[PDB]
Amino acid sequence: QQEPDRFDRDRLFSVVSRGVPEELTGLLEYLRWNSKYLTDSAYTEGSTGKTCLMKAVLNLQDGVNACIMPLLQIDKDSGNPKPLVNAQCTDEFYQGHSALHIAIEKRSLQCVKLLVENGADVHLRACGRFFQKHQGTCFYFGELPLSLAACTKQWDVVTYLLENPHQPASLEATDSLGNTVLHALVMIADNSPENSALVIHMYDGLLQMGARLCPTVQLEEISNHQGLTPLKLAAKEGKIEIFRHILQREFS
């Protein structure tokens, strides 16, 4: 008894950035003694700021951080009602970013898997506050982890987000503009011959999965906040090439 050693934020962030989990011993003991969680202001860069898990994901080696599992375990064992996994960062650079968003943004499937396997909400919303404003690291990708993976051309990630048995991500989910992943692709698309080809490939792939995962729901008839289906939006936005593609699919 009569313990345990102080484990401040500075030290925790140093260890998670380097990657070695063996130096996290004593953290659980301290947290529990003082009834503290890794989501408290004391352990984040300002209340509402980076959690230690986001710091872990921001420092990848080979696509993984060996701290992520130990960290998510410590949080579980500490009795946190609001799991560290679903915490969202919101500072000068980030806006509603979960570790999941960062994991997808860092193009790491093994890290995405790892997070989803430990109760990550695949429906948290990032970059909702900023809409064609150049402020932080935020851009429009449709503010949904699935949309992000699709807009960033990561099929293997899209595949896993839709199929995994832990937390499947619905294709029917919409962002603050009522925009589905299909809408987001139309938006994200420039009218380059190379880019349009890749967006079409991704677009089609999701409808294939649409037929398998939600066969009853006609994804392409889903209208957004301005009363636009992906077809209508494609015309409004002047994205001629992919508008030409959605058109043909309708006339079959």
Side-chain angles (χ1 to χ4, degrees):
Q1 221 131 64
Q2 63 229 353
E3 56 183 297
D5 287 334
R6 184 95 159 89
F7 215 119
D8 55 298
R9 181 172 73 256
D10 292 344
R11 182 185 157 194
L12 170 62
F13 272 51
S14 309
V15 174
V16 297
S17 54
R18 267 175 288 111
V20 279
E22 290 95 325
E23 274 163 5
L24 292 175
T25 51
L27 180 68
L28 187 66
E29 291 64 38
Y30 184 73
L31 287 167
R32 288 192 59 83
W33 187 279
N34 295 267
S35 315
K36 286 203 177 77
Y37 307 125
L38 294 170
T39 46
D40 300 342
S41 292
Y43 283 88
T44 67
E45 299 189 338
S47 60
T48 247
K50 281 90 161 275
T51 66
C52 63
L53 175 66
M54 285 160 202
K55 193 82 172 171
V57 174
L58 275 163
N59 299 270
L60 293 175
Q61 290 185 54
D62 198 69
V64 281
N65 196 316
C67 278
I68 303 163
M69 253 314 201
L71 271 183
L72 292 170
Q73 192 59 228
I74 284 166
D75 192 69
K76 222 285 171 183
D77 291 319
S78 57
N80 197 351
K82 289 144 154 58
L84 181 71
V85 70
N86 293 325
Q88 291 172 259
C89 181
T90 316
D91 58 19
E92 36 190 305
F93 311 100
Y94 294 93
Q95 199 298 103
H97 287 84
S98 60
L100 188 52
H101 284 95
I102 295 159
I104 299 161
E105 209 160 286
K106 298 279 286 311
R107 307 184 78 75
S108 168
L109 167 69
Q110 53 263 72
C111 193
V112 168
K113 280 203 192 83
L114 220 148
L115 280 173
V116 173
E117 278 156 31
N118 301 296
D121 183 357
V122 290
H123 296 285
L124 297 169
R125 291 167 160 86
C127 299
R129 301 273 296 174
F130 296 95
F131 40 98
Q132 208 205 319
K133 293 210 222 79
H134 203 225
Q135 174 73 36
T137 199
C138 266
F139 69 106
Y140 185 83
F141 47 77
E143 297 173 34
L144 281 155
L146 176 69
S147 300
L148 175 62
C151 287
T152 53
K153 298 157 280 177
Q154 304 189 53
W155 180 253
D156 66 332
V157 178
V158 173
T159 307
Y160 183 89
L161 284 167
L162 293 170
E163 286 175 342
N164 77 278
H166 319 293
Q167 271 96 43
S170 166
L171 291 150
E172 315 183 41
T174 53
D175 75 7
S176 70
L177 317 177
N179 275 345
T180 70
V181 56
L182 301 161
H183 291 270
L185 288 164
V186 169
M187 293 299 288
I188 228 300
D190 61 61
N191 221 106
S192 163
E194 195 157 344
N195 175 280
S196 280
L198 302 179
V199 168
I200 284 158
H201 272 78
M202 180 65 67
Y203 191 95
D204 275 315
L206 292 164
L207 290 169
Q208 281 202 332
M209 300 267 150
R212 318 194 321 98
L213 301 158
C214 50
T216 176
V217 177
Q218 214 159 64
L219 294 173
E220 227 155 359
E221 297 299 285
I222 301 176
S223 192
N224 74 3
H225 279 25
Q226 275 185 348
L228 307 166
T229 61
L231 172 75
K232 306 261 196 67
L233 184 69
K236 204 185 194 191
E237 298 299 325
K239 314 298 168 72
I240 318 295
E241 226 296 308
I242 117 105
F243 171 74
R244 197 174 189 173
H245 181 84
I246 298 167
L247 229 165
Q248 300 208 262
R249 279 184 60 81
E250 196 198 312
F251 289 88
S252 308

